[PDB]
Design a protein around this ligand. Structure first.
Ligand SMILES: CCOP(=O)(COc1ccc(C[C@H](NC(=O)O[C@H]2CO[C@H]3OCC[C@H]32)[C@H](O)CN(C[C@@H](C)CC)S(=O)(=O)c2ccc(OC)cc2)cc1)OCC
Lengths: 99, 99
C-alpha cells in the first residue's frame, strides 16, 4: 500500500503468533519491540536513541509479518516507548520513501 | 524521487540560509535539529524517545527546503545527534511510505 504521514504510520504486525501495533520508522536502523516473551536464545545488547541508551534482548532470525508481508530478521526487545519497525525489516518488505 | 532504505535516508536540507544533512524519519512526530542559533522567540519543550527525554527549543513557522521541496512548520532545536525531519514537514513535501 501507500501510507501518508498525516498520522503516525502504525500497522498491525504478527510476531510469535501474537498481534501487535508497530510504527514504521525510517529513522530507526533496527527493530525494537516492547517487553515480550519470545522463544529461543537471545544476546544482551545496547542501543542508543534521542534520550540515551537502553538494554535490549537481541533475537535473531525471528519471523514477523508486517501488514501482510513476511520478514525474518533481528528483533530487539526492551523498554522502548513504542514498537518500532526499523530499516532492517522495512527493506525486507520492500518499503521505500517516495515524494 | 524514490529512496530505498538499505542505508539511512539522509538528504540535504536548507534552513535559515544554511545547508545541512538530515534524516527523513517517519517515526518522528516532529522535526529535531542540531544546536543552531536561530533568530526569534522560542518556547522550552521536552521530547522523549529511546533512552529518555531531552530539552529542546521550539521555533515556529520555520521554513526548511528538503530536496528542493519547501516546507514551513515547527522546528525543535537541541542536543540531538542527527538532524531529524519529522512527519510535520514530511507531509508537506508529499512524502509517503510504499510497499
Ligand atoms: C552518533 C550518535 O547516535 P546515537 O546512537 C542516537 O542517534 C539517533 C537518535 C534518534 C533517531 C530517530 C529515532 N530512532 C531511534 O531511536 O532508533 C534507534 C533503533 O534503531 C537505531 O537506529 C537509530 C537509533 C536507534 C526515531 O526514528 C524517532 N524517535 C521516536 C521513536 C522512538 C518513536 C517514539 S525520536 O528521535 O526519539 C523522536 C521523538 C519525538 C519527536 O517529536 C515529538 C521527534 C523524534 C535516529 C538516530 O547516540 C546515542 C546517545
Amino acid at each position: 500500500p501507500q501510507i501518508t504521514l498525516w498520522k503516525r504510520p502504525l500497522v498491525t504486525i504478527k510476531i510469535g503468533g501474537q498481534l501487535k501495533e508497530a510504527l514504521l520508522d525510517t529513522g530507526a536502523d533496527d527493530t525494537v519491540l516492547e517487553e515480550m516473551n519470545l522463544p529461543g536464545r537471545w544476546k544482551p545488547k545496547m542501543i542508543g536513541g534521542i534520550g540515551g541508551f537502553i538494554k535490549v534482548r537481541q533475537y535473531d532470525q525471528i519471523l514477523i509479518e508486517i501488514c501482510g508481508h513476511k520478514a525474518i530478521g533481528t528483533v530487539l526487545v526492551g523498554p522502548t516507548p513504542v514498537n518500532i519497525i526499523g530499516r532492517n525489516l522495512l527493506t525486507q518488505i520492500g518499503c521505500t520513501l517516495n515524494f
